[PDB]
Every structure is written in structure tokens, then in C-alpha cells.
């Protein structure tokens, strides 16, 4: 069981440890984010129990790391002296000091191939194919890849990440095989981070620590696509035999 989401598109930003103006993202997706996306695809309002999404497994193969960019983001500026974002007491600020400036970072031009393995994976897949809310990647303004769900049904999808999945073009030496690609499994762990989601309600966001271990694996060089227009093509023909 399981399916292979294809995390790609113009921009991605999985945030963490940022409860102020300055927002930051991780160099790889976080289960809280994509579990929020499945939850958004199944129609569970914030505050509902998320126990159903427990018992899931997410190994993610990073195709390209992508470069980090900072997004400057001012909110409430230029508006007249009687329209901004109120204060808790209700007394607005002076228009010269009214707007609030947040500089939210984001990860750009990267593509990940996650491998979901869970008991509810089939309904999750069928929910992503038709959701009850626009599914996004990190934040609402980021639009996901069209091929959000690369392969809908595969037994042992991890083996599919280790072999027979298209990769974007990169420098490959002559008649060289064994090109390394990093994938994260969850001793010899890399880091601990607040990912497991316990509650999404806006009144009390509650998360917990989760282990992460990045293993650099080797893949045969027969997956690297060509210079341009070849990668998207090869992945289309790859998603073509999904019916078969």
C-alpha cells in the first residue's frame, strides 16, 4: 500500500519554530505540513482529532535541494489612518507605524519525492484527487504541482524511490553509475524537530518532537533526465503506466 506524492512547483515553505514576524522554512518537507495537506484534502476542520493520521510513514527522497529565498512581506501599509489590523485593546496605531512587516522565508525551485506508507493511504490518495479545500505546499499562496500524486497505488513505494523514478538533470560523469540522492527516514539520527501534529486549532497549536535521519543513498544513473523538457516528459510517461 501507499502512494508517491511529488512535492514540486514554484515555491515551497514548510515552517517551524517561528511564532513571530520572521518566518523560516526547512530544507525539506515536514510531516506537520503535508499531514495538514492530507487533513485539508479530507475535510477535517481545525480542532478535530487528528488521530487518524497517526501510524503513517514518510520517507522523502530529495531530488534537488533548491535554493532558499527570503520573501519580504509587509501587511497593512498604505491604508488610510482608519484601516489597518487592530490591536488587542482595539486602539489602532498611527498610520506611520500602523503596518506590520514580516519577512517570511521560503524554499524555491526544489522537488521532493515523498513515499507515504499508511493504513489510510488509499482514502488519502483519493482525497488528494478531489479535495474539500485547495491543497497547498507549506502556505496557502504556494500552488502545488499538477502531478501532486505521482503514483496512486504501489506496494513498497520506498523501493520505487530507490529505483525507477525520474530525476532532474544534473552533472553525470562519463559512463558513471551510483549517483547519490539523500532520503530521510524517521542512534544515528540527524536532528529532532517539532513535526508530529497533535492539534491544529488556531486557539492552541500543539506539536511535539520527532526524530529524523538522513541517509544518502545511491541510485543508478539511468534516471537522470536530459538537459531541458526531458524531465517533465519522462515523468509524464512514468505516470502513464499508473493505470497498468
Amino acid at each position: 500500500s501507499g502512494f508517491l506524492l511529488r512535492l514540486a512547483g514554484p515555491m515551497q515553505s514548510w515552517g517551524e519554530h517561528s511564532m513571530f514576524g520572521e518566518r523560516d522554512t526547512l530544507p525539506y518537507p515536514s510531516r506537520s505540513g503535508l499531514i495538514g495537506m492530507f487533513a485539508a484534502a479530507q475535510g477535517v476542520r481545525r480542532g478535530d482529532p487528528l488521530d487518524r493520521y497517526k501510524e503513517l510513514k514518510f520517507t522523502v527522497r530529495v531530488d534537488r535541494p533548491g535554493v532558499r529565498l527570503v520573501d519580504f512581506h509587509t501587511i497593512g501599509g498604505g491604508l488610510p489612518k482608519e484601516r489597518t489590523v487592530p490591536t488587542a485593546a482595539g486602539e489602532r496605531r498611527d498610520p506611520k507605524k500602523a503596518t506590520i512587516v514580516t519577512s517570511r522565508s521560503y524554499l524555491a525551485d526544489a522537488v521532493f519525492t515523498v513515499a507515504v506508507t499508511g493504513p489510510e493511504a488509499d482514502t488519502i490518495a483519493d482525497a488528494l484527487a478531489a479535495p474539500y479545500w485547495q491543497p497547498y505546499l507549506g502556505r496557502r499562496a504556494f500552488v502545488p504541482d499538477p502531478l501532486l500524486v505521482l503514483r496512486r497505488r504501489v506496494a513498497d513505494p520506498v523501493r520505487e524511490l530507490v529505483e525507477a523514478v525520474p530525476l532532474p538533470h544534473r552533472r553525470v560523469e562519463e559512463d558513471a553509475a551510483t549517483v547519490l540522492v539523500d532520503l530521510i527516514y524517521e542512534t544515528r539520527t540527524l536532528t529532532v524537530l517539532n513535526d508530529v501534529p497533535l492539534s491544529f486549532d488556531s486557539k492552541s497549536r500543539r506539536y511535539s518532537t520527532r526524530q529524523i535521519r538522513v541517509v544518502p543513498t545511491e541510485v543508478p544513473a539511468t534516471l537522470v533526465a536530459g538537459p531541458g523538457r526531458d524531465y517533465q516528459n519522462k515523468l509524464f510517461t512514468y505516470v502513464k503506466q499508473c493505470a497498468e
Binding site: F20, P27, R68, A88, A89, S208
Partner: protein
């Protein structure tokens, strides 16, 4: 009556060294007594963790460490003693109950008389209440704008769990804004202003091991021999808002737990497990700098003789666990004294040292009243795995030599790039480039680090050579060259930017 004592009430998220499944809540006495069974304890707020780990270390030093040096070559004999407690393996339960026996009446948060590290007199004497919003972090206060950290309209105050209340409380009592807090009428005198927190805007470094026990005793800084003093909750009589705060050479006065610059209070709910209102205001109005500088922080000297903690930087947290790696090095003046008296070999630990790991709780902020970000940093155990997995002495030493080298040079070029951008922008106009340059520089330069540790072909330099091979230097040229590239068109900016750009080329040791 509502009551909540940290002794037995569960408020600390704890997990054992076992399976690592279903961690659960534990009180203070319970996580202490069976520390030998628990892997580690944590609370979601890194500020609250930076103070929590200080009170925990002070407690374990109240009983375990005995926090009192003997008098026959004291320092040395003390290191021996604590090495013996470490050799034993755990805590004495009759010692734990023997320490609470003297203070079983102190730890109630909502004690009607003299509560736990709060000011009971501040109940009255305050015209208005500061509100729970100001006590909670990342929550919109009266003047803030209701956009982030979940809407909280100064009204319908979502009551906080007593656990969250002691977390935010312990953090605010540590890191704290300075300026225009709730006014108090002391002896008929009212003074609406407040000083800043003692740890505000600084990164803390706490060593942690396999079991919580050795972590606790390793977090014990050598108690400066002096007049034995007590922490805040031990003092028999409540402090005077006016007057100079008591002086303390003992560890209780160097862990910043003898007197705090703030004074908070929790208004209990009839249920007893929720806080409804709070009070946050000045507790001491006359300035006082703490002697015997904090062993956790990193201090750097400026001109004129003043010593100040190196401020935090979100730009360093752009990559995870960056400061965590300070266990390598070390590093040129950039090292906490607690590490300088517990991590090396001049101490008497034998095998827990071979599994020691560093952790860092940082909360960058402006020194007055504006907060920017928090972040934790636990060192990657994988860097230990690589050194152990090969089982070759020369390779076990070549690997760690490669991590040490890459880290030292990495931060070296980081600061060299900072001064490069500061002089470039400060001289261009005759700054705003440091934020972008640094952010993009670490964000980009850390995958190179992981690229060098696995001796994989990195930018600039291929595996095989001795050290970092001078590669992230090229990464610094990339970040610097692109952050200021579109602006170096006219010859003025071009020649100044270049003149400062001819520094990154050093060290730059050739092939």
C-alpha cells in the same frame, strides 16, 4: 482552595532512554528522582528551557553536587567528588525528599502566602492587571497588532494550562522586555518602568548526554567559593522593591536565580488547573550587574573594557543545529566556561564524555522590547556515527579533523563576510546587506558542510585532500557577489565593493 505544586504535578515533557515511544508528563521531583530511568526532559519553549535547565541544574546541585566546595585544594577535590557521584549512577531518593522536606511549602504556584518565585504582595498594590497575553509569549498584547501567533483580542482571554503558565512564566521571568509595564505603588511611590531580562537576546549552551543524570551533573558550574547563598524560592523573607538586591558569590547568584528583574503572578481559577489573569511588572528598580559572569553564554569584549554576551542571530539558525557543533573547535575565545570546566579531560569523567552532546537555546531579540525568533540546536549524532563506524584510528582521527576544520573555517568566513558587508554598505553611502548576505550564506554553505563530511565531490574542491579544501570560501564569494551584484554597476560602488571583496581571498590556501 486551588493549588498547584511543581513537585508532583506533571508539567515537563519527559521521555526515557528506552523504546522512545509515548513520552509523557512528569513533575519536578518525579523527573529528578528517576532521572536515571529517563533519557531527557524538555518543554516546547527554548527560553523556558534555558531557565528550566538552570533551576534543574541548581536543584541537582543542591543535593547531588552538594554545591559546596570542601577546603583542601577545593576545585580539584570537588571535581573528584562529583566524579564519584557520576560513578555511582543515580540520585538518592531520601536526598530528594530530604531537600523538599526543608521546602515542601515553597513550590506551590498558587500558594496564598509567598508563592513559588512570584510576588504575593503584588496581588494588591497594582491598579490594573497586566493580563495573561503579556505573560504568554507569541501572543498579542495590548499594543501589539492581532495578526500572528493566533488571534487574542485582549478580551476572551483563553485561559492557559498551569503547565503552559509555568513555561511562559519561567521564560518571561528570564527573557523579559524592558519598558512601560504595569505600575506599582511602593510605599506610596509609583514607578511605571521596568528593566530588561538578564538573559534577553542571548544563546545558551547546555551539555546533554545519554541519560538525564549525567546531563544534570554536567550542567553544574563550579560553585564559586563564597558566601553560600540561596535561590529565589529559598530566601526566608520576601525582597524589598527598593534597595539594592542582595549580592551572591555562590552559584545561586551566578545562575541568575537569586533575584529577577521582573515580578509576575498567576491568578488561579477555581478549578486549580487554569490561569485566568496574570501580573507582569517591575520587581527591582535600581540597576545591578551580576558579578561572576554567566558560564552558559559566550562573552566577547568590545572597546573601553565592557564585556557583553554575543547576541543571537536568526541568520545562524537558517540551518539547523549550527551552534550545536561548538563541541568541535575550540574556537578562539568563543567558548562557555561551563564547557571549559566539564567537557575537557582536565576533569574526571571517563566514558560519558565519549557520548557528550551540546544543545543551544537561542532567542534573538532587540535589547529593548522587540522579539524576533527562538530556536533550539541539538548537535547531530551522525557526526559521532561517522567517527565510530570506521573503527580505524587514523581514519577516526582524520574524520574528526575534517569536521573540526570545516566548522572553524566555516564560521571564520562567516564573520569575515559580516565585516565585509558592514564595511561595504557603510562605505558605499559615505546596514541592510548583512541580513541577506548572511542568511543566504549560511543557508547555502551548510549543504557544502554535509558534502565535505561525507567526502563527496563538493563545489570548488573534490574529496581526498586534508581539510575543508577551501570550498565554502567560494560559497562566501557566491553569496557576497550576488547580494551586492546588481548594485555595483556604477564605478563608485564597484570600486568600494571590490576593495572590500578582496578579503574573502584569505586564508585561501592553494592546492
Amino acid at each position: 482552595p486551588p493549588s498547584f505544586d511543581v513537585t508532583i504535578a506533571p508539567w515537563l515533557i519527559a521521555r526515557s532512554r528506552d523504546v522512545l515511544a509515548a513520552p509523557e508528563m512528569l513533575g519536578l521531583r518525579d523527573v529528578l528522582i528517576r532521572s536515571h530511568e529517563l533519557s531527557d526532559v524538555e518543554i516546547p519553549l527554548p527560553p523556558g528551557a534555558a531557565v528550566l535547565w538552570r533551576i534543574l541544574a541548581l536543584i541537582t546541585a543542591r543535593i547531588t553536587g552538594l554545591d559546596q566546595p570542601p577546603n583542601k585544594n577545593p576545585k580539584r577535590k570537588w571535581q573528584a567528588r562529583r566524579s564519584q557521584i557520576l560513578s555511582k549512577g543515580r540520585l538518592d531518593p531520601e536526598a530528594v525528599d530530604a531537600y523538599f522536606a526543608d521546602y515542601s511549602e515553597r513550590f506551590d504556584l498558587f500558594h496564598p502566602e509567598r508563592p513559588w518565585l512570584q510576588d504575593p504582595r503584588l496581588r494588591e498594590e497594582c491598579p490594573k492587571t497586566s493580563g495573561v497575553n503579556k505573560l504568554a509569549w507569541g501572543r498579542t498584547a495590548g499594543e501589539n497588532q492581532v495578526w500572528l501567533g493566533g488571534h487574542h483580542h485582549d478580551l476572551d482571554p483563553h485561559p492557559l494550562d498551569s503547565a503552559e503558565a509555568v513555561w511562559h512564566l519561567l521564560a518571561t521571568l528570564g527573557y523579559g522586555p524592558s519598558g512601560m509595564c504595569t505600575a506599582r505603588v511602593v510605599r506610596g511611590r509609583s514607578e511605571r518602568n521596568v528593566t530588561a531580562g538578564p538573559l534577553r537576546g542571548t544563546v545558551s549552551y547546555h551539555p546533554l548526554g545519554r541519560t538525564l543524570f549525567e546531563s544534570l551533573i554536567l550542567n553544574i558550574p563550579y560553585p564559586g567559593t563564597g558566601a553560600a547563598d540561596l535561590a529565589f524560592w529559598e530566601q526566608p523573607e520576601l525582597n524589598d522593591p527598593l534597595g539594592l538586591p542582595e549580592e551572591s558569590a555562590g552559584l545561586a547568584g551566578i545562575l541568575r536565580l537569586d533575584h529577577f528583574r521582573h515580578a509576575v503572578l498567576l491568578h488561579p481559577s477555581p478549578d486549580g488547573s487554569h490561569v485566568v489573569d496574570a501580573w507582569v511588572t517591575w520587581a527591582w528598580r535600581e540597576r545591578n550587574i551580576s558579578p561572576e559572569l554567566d558560564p552558559y553564554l559566550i562573552y566577547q569584549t568590545s572597546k573601553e573594557g565592557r564585556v557583553y554576551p554575543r547576541p543571537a542571530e536568526a541568520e545562524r539558525a537558517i540551518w539547523r543545529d549550527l551552534d550545536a557543533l561548538l563541541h568541535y573547535g575550540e574556537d578562539g575565545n568563543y567558548r562557555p566556561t561551563i564547557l571549559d570546566n566539564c567537557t575537557p579531560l582536565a576533569q574526571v569523567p571517563q566514558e560519558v564524555l565519549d557520548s557528550l552532546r551540546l544543545r543551544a537555546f537561542g532567542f534573538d531579540q532587540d535589547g529593548q522590547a522587540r522579539d524576533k525568533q527562538w530556536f533550539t540546536a541539538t548537535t547531530p549524532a551522525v557526526l559521532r556515527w561517522l567517527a565510530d563506524r570506521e573503527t580505524d584510528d587514523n581514519e577516526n582521527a582524520r574524520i574528526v579533523r575534517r569536521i573540526t576544520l570545516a566548522r572553524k573555517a566555516a564560521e571564520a568566513l562567516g564573520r569575515r563576510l559580516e565585516k565585509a558587508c558592514k564595511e561595504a554598505w557603510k562605505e558605499s553611502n559615505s546596514g541592510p546587506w548583512v541580513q541577506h548576505g548572511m542568511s543566504r550564506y549560511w543557508a547555502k554553505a551548510e549543504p557544502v558542510f554535509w558534502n565535505i563530511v561525507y567526502d563527496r565531490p563538493a563545489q570548488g574542491y573534490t574529496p581526498g585532500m586534508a581539510g575543508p579544501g577551501n570550498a565554502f570560501n567560494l560559497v562566501a564569494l557566491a553569496a557576497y557577489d550576488e547580494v551586492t551584484g546588481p548594485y555595483c554597476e556604477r564605478p563608485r560602488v564597484a570600486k568600494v565593493v571590490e576593495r572590500h571583496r578582496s578579503t574573502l581571498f584569505s586564508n585561501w590556501t592553494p592546492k
